[PDB]
A paper describes a structure:
In this parasite, threonine degradation pathway occurs within the mitochondrion, where the amino acid is initially oxidized to 2-amino-3-ketobutyrate (AKB) by a NAD+ dependent L-threonine dehydrogenase (TDH, 1.1.1.103) and then cleaved into glycine and acetyl-CoA by a 2-amino-3-ketobutyrate coenzyme A ligase (AKCL, 2.3.1.29). Finally, we report the crystal structure of TcTDH and characterize its allosteric activation by potassium. The tertiary structure of TcTDH comprises two domains composed of alternating protein segments. The cofactor-binding domain adopts a characteristic Rossman motif and contains both catalytic residues, Thr-130 and Tyr-155.
Crystallographic structures of recombinant TcTDH without natural ligands (apo-TcTDH) and in complex with NAD+ and acetate (holo-TcTDH) were determined and refined to 2.1 and 1.73 Å resolution, respectively. In both crystals, asymmetric units (ASU) comprise two polypeptide chains, related by a non-crystallographic symmetry two-fold axis. The two protomers in ASU correspond to the homodimeric biological unit. For apo-TcTDH, the initial 12 residues of chains A and B and the terminal two residues from the C-terminus of chain B were omitted. The potassium-binding site is situated opposite to the catalytic site. In TcTDH, K+ is observed in octahedral coordination established through interactions with residues in the catalytic domain (Glu-221, Pro-222, and Ala-288) and cofactor-binding domain (Trp-291, Pro-292, and Asp-293). Four interactions are established between K+ and the main chain carbonyl of Pro-222, Ala-288, Trp-291, and Pro-292, and two interactions with the side chain carboxyl of Glu-221 and Asp-293. Although not directly interacting with K+, residues His-289, Lys-140, Asn-142, and Thr-143 formed a secondary layer of hydrogen bonds that imposed additional constraints on this region. Collectively, these interactions connect the largest loop of the N1 segment with residues in the N3 segment and with the potassium-binding site. The potassium-binding site of TcTDH superposes with a methylation site in mTDH, both located between the catalytic and cofactor-binding domains.
Numbering used by the authors:
A (entry chain B): 13 to 330
B (entry chain A): 13 to 332
Write the structure that this text describes.
Amino acid sequence: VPRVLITGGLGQIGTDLTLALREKFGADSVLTSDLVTPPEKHPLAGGKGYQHLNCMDRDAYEKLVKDFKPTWLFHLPAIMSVRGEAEPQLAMNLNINSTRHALDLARDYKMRCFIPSTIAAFGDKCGKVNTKDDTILNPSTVYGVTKVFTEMIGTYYREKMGTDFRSVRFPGIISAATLPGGGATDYAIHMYHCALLGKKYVCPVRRDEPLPMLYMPDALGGVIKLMEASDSCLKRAVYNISGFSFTPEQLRASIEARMKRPLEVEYVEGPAQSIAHSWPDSLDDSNARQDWGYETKYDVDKMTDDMLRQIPVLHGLP
Amino acid sequence: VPRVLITGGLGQIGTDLTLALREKFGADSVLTSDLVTPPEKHPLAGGKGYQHLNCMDRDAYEKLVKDFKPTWLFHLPAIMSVRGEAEPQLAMNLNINSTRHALDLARDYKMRCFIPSTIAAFGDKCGKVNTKDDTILNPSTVYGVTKVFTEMIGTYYREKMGTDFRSVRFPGIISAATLPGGGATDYAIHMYHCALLGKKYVCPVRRDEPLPMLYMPDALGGVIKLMEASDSCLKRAVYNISGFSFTPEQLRASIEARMKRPLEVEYVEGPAQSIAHSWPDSLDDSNARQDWGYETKYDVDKMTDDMLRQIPVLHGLPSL
Ligand SMILES: [K+]
Ligand SMILES: [K+]
């Protein structure tokens, strides 16, 4: 049974991944870490199996790996699109340096090492329709720039430093738990919230701007499946993974068809749109399907049905 | 005329560029820095116009920018291909952090900022024949990795941070002044010296491995023309520049033809070969031609003639 260290585990992915992996391998085989103690409202709060770690601090990072001796590492800490634009200095600091520490430690303590990439690695030259795994990368965000670095140094580690580095490019990840932030793709989450509170939604992404999206369980399914795969199946270190591609208009319709009551949406083109427009419309994830059996269970309507049921439950909502 | 700060100036390009700009703009216009005191026998030795700078020290970097108050920055420090495989940590430390500091400084002090990229940015997926400016980048060296980062953050600074960032992808750069060492593309220099000394050369690059190469004068031509170009001609931030491509066997033929005598070469694969194999065979530099008028004056035979006259004079090797 894998011994699992997750870093940056307070995030949506880290939280759900902690829970899935406890269920899967038992609570004692999983150690989650992040900068601060879980907030009292957060799903990991109070609970044990949690450790403080600043991933920027290499010695503390090495100590934790020497102590716990994980066989799998999930290095999740990142500054994403939004905050990345507001503080490029921080983004480059955390994303680059902590990634370098993760890889060095995976090399030295022989860990299977997952560090996620993102659709933000792509920019407007990617070929926006069914974007291939191998293509021109011209990210127009710092976050994107850092994640391309991650992709390249990680792949370098796999090819030349015998390091079992593995990665996917996450599209927009949708989740019922994630209280909805400011990030590009978070509009999807926001829309469901508003639809349940019966308020008008203010959408900063163009009505007809398509984005690759993925529902959390399929995302978690993918990450775990890739982590369980055989080195000899993996022709690549970094894999696009897809759920579905949609525009705000199509998501609105999904939600309307499900609720049989209409949802008011005002398109107010924020900086999210300019970033979104530089990203792919849809992703080709055939290398993932082929190499290691990636699959998805949720189409837009199932996700809609689920989210519209799960939010009231998790958030004490109508 | 511009005020020029060159960092990492003790390398071939730094030195040669320092001289060209001393010439072009006047010695008091140019300041050159590197980590170490210039060697005894070095073009920038002794005289003023040279300063120690550790570019990984941001405060020292800013201080020197505050003192000298340049308008042109040429950030040239880098650990390159071969040394980077041996010291990947040092390569990323300097290649990434120094680059980051120069961009920040050039933004803040409004400098036109040149930071070279390289053919090492490319990997075996680039499309190796006439490699385009826009292609798949899968570098297999630490150096290449750090230079792709350079291109992307530099391009990001240009689009979003109002920073006059400009770059070329250097092919392997040949100069008569460079003393032949262990660098990825150094075989070409070695062949020239061995020709004149009349000794056998053991070549670590495969006999038929093509590489984009460029003669120093055309390299300096390109950088200076690019650094002088009007912003509104620059459709991109980073541009392939090319001179010629050739294999070891083609370079040797050029040398033989010129010297009217055989050059003895033995091909024993060294570490340069797997690096070189992952690089383009030839570059497409049409965008540099079109946008800002990049041009070249040396083909291989004209570089061969020049090298074979220049090396005897610069190094005291036996002349033709
Ligand atoms: K898009
Ligand atoms: K080649």
